[PDB]
Amino acid sequence: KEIPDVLVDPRTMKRYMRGRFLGKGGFAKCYEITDMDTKEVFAGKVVPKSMLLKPHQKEKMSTEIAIHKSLDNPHVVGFHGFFEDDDFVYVVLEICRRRSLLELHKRRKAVTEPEARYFMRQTIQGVQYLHNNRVIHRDLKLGNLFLNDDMDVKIGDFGLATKIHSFEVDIWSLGCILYTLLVGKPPFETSCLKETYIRIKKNEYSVPRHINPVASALIRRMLHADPTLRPSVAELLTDEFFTSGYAPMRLPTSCLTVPPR
């Protein structure tokens, strides 16, 4: 069924012009949507009610919206109102024109140490906000760390997020990200899906000899078997890793394809 070329709502009564396709995400599709009056551009999640015919799944999205709506931080994807018609459910969000930290990883492999410091810092700060406000993200990944024209990390995607395992699962995801950034391959990545689950359970990984000792230290603790021995969000920024070597305040857009000089 056709998705309308213009998008209007009974609430705000603003008109959104359906522009260019941006990508898929399960049952969700994203389009660059423009406000027809202000000319302000947004990322519009469009989910059909045909995928939301079930009362069970319909909760997941109304839980996610409720949590995203309450958020306002310079490191979390800006929530900007949701609505629905008979056919589709629409979510209006902050536009991040530089795709995600996944695309960066795939194109760069192992980033330089000062880059990962920067990306981690900005990411961790948003995770602090979340954690301060009783929110656990539960699904932090590179695909979820969105990048804008200023190379600013903005955490999105709360499909599996909850409000109050506890907070220290988010600290684990962050360990993975830091690993994948510094090393260039995910720490538990394998071809077989079931194998991956075993690796996690048994805690099977090894940080290569080539990685900085201080860096491999922070990684190991963020990945520690005992969740209660993982560092708290606040304890991360203060770590030697962020405070030892160079930590740039801004990154060029060139970092998307080539290392900075």
Ligand SMILES: COc1cc(C(=O)NC2CCN(C)CC2)ccc1Nc1cc2c(cn1)c(C)nn2-c1cc(Cl)cc(CCC(N)=O)c1
């Ligand atoms: C304007 O900046 C963007 C560009 C693109 C893009 O160029 N995608 C290419 C288009 C061509 N096809 C062949 C491959 C992906 C994609 C997303 C952009 N921005 C952009 C995307 C955004 C957001 C903000 N801003 C938010 C918030 N959530 N999402 C979001 C949401 C979903 Cl459901 C899926 C994806 C996915 C993946 C993908 N294919 O890259 C992203």
